[PDB]
Amino acid sequence: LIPEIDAFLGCPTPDAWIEAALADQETLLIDHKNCEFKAASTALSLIAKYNTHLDLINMMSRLAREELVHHEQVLRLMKRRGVPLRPVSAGRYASGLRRLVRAHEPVKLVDTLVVGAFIEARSCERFAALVPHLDEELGRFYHGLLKSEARHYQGYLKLAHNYGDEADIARCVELVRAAEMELIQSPDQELRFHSGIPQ
Amino acid sequence: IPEIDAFLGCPTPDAWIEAALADQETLLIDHKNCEFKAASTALSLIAKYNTHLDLINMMSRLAREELVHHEQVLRLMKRRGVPLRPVSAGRYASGLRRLVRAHEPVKLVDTLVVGAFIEARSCERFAALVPHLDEELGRFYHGLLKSEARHYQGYLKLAHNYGDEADIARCVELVRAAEMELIQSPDQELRFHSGIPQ
Numbered sequence A: 001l002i003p004e005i006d007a008f009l010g011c012p013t014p015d016a017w018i019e020a021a022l023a024d025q026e027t028l029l030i031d032h033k034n035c036e037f038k039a040a041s042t043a044l045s046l047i048a049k050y051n052t053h054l055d056l057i058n059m060m061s062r063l064a065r066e067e068l069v070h071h072e073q074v075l076r077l078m079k080r081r082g083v084p085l086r087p088v089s090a091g092r093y094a095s096g097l098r099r100l101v102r103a104h105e106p107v108k109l110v111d112t113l114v115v116g117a118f119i120e121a122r123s124c125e126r127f128a129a130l131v132p133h134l135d136e137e138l139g140r141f142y143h144g145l146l147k148s149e150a151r152h153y154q155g156y157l158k159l160a161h162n163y164g165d166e167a168d169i170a171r172c173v174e175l176v177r178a179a180e181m182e183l184i185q186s187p188d189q190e191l192r193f194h195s196g197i198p199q
Numbered sequence B: 001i002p003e004i005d006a007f008l009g010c011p012t013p014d015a016w017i018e019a020a021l022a023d024q025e026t027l028l029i030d031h032k033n034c035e036f037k038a039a040s041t042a043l044s045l046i047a048k049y050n051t052h053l054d055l056i057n058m059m060s061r062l063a064r065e066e067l068v069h070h071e072q073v074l075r076l077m078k079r080r081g082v083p084l085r086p087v088s089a090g091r092y093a094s095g096l097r098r099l100v101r102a103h104e105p106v107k108l109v110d111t112l113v114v115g116a117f118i119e120a121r122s123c124e125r126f127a128a129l130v131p132h133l134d135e136e137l138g139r140f141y142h143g144l145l146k147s148e149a150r151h152y153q154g155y156l157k158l159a160h161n162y163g164d165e166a167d168i169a170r171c172v173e174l175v176r177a178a179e180m181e182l183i184q185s186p187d188q189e190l191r192f193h194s195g196i197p198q
């Protein structure tokens, strides 16, 4: 398969989420820094767990390097804007999606790779949603991250097909799409980069 | 920052080289795993010392280089039909981690000094092997020397942000003695940082 990001996601970022993000951009930016690092950390955990899946290892090693660069780019921007390293707790999103990962191998891996495609897919969509509302410096940076995010999305789907069956993958995608949109549109008590709508 | 030769207490023993040369498949696979654990350890430090800006910047870059090394070893493996055979971790790194004190900032000091030692030893050990390997592999290993030397220097420079000059020197004295004992003591497995046979 491997479709366009707009067709993969079940909904766009709500306007109510954007309004919350614009009114607390510093929290956003720090969380973002954190997301880029978690993505690298998760990538390395996949390599340790699936330590005989050669294509996954090579892809995850590269993805982690790329995510670290993102991490460093956000830090460089935080510095330029005088944004300190203050603690911001992990949002609910990723753990929410991981509750959908099946129990047994080899389908557990497939679901794990699909969730990664959704996280990347969502990030790309949300960066795109924000760009028009941000200042030039931050908007230009976010716009540049879109293409990496799409590349990461495609990478997870390609791994999925490599280790999974066409129809199983299509069903998984359908089920993760529903749970993801619920995490995105449901109320949330905090503002994170992948939070729901703050109430 | 002293030269790597002055930093280590001993060179790599002959019996280790002879064993390494006789099982280059285990050598390569374990080396690949060390590059991976070097990256993993760097991200772990970042998570742990997440407000130390110089530290996170240095470890972020270091992790990225280790992941290139990992990818490099894997490509060499594929070319030579060396499979992804699971290989258990050796004792060296956990042996050195026992030296780490429990309270900050000396915990971090000890941690960084240990990092410098691992890197310095890898640099010395690649060097000791180079003249005995096939051309391609030997030149690849020579090329990693410069990199490990920079990692060694980074760890040690960073350690100087957390302990005065005499305290870091004392830390280094103690870690050197321990590292040498790990390198020269009998070991049953062959691993990149394993000891000697029997």
Ligand SMILES: [O-][O-]
Binding pocket: A035, A036, A039, A067, A119, A120, A123
């Ligand atoms: O950030 O993925």
Ligand SMILES: [Fe+3]
Binding pocket: A036, A039, A066, A067, A070
């Ligand atoms: Fe990223």
Ligand SMILES: [Fe+3]
Binding pocket: A039, A067, A120, A148, A149, A152
């Ligand atoms: Fe990504």
Ligand SMILES: [Fe+3]
Binding pocket: B035, B038, B065, B066, B069
């Ligand atoms: Fe390395």
Ligand SMILES: [Fe+3]
Binding pocket: B038, B066, B119, B147, B148, B151
């Ligand atoms: Fe290194």
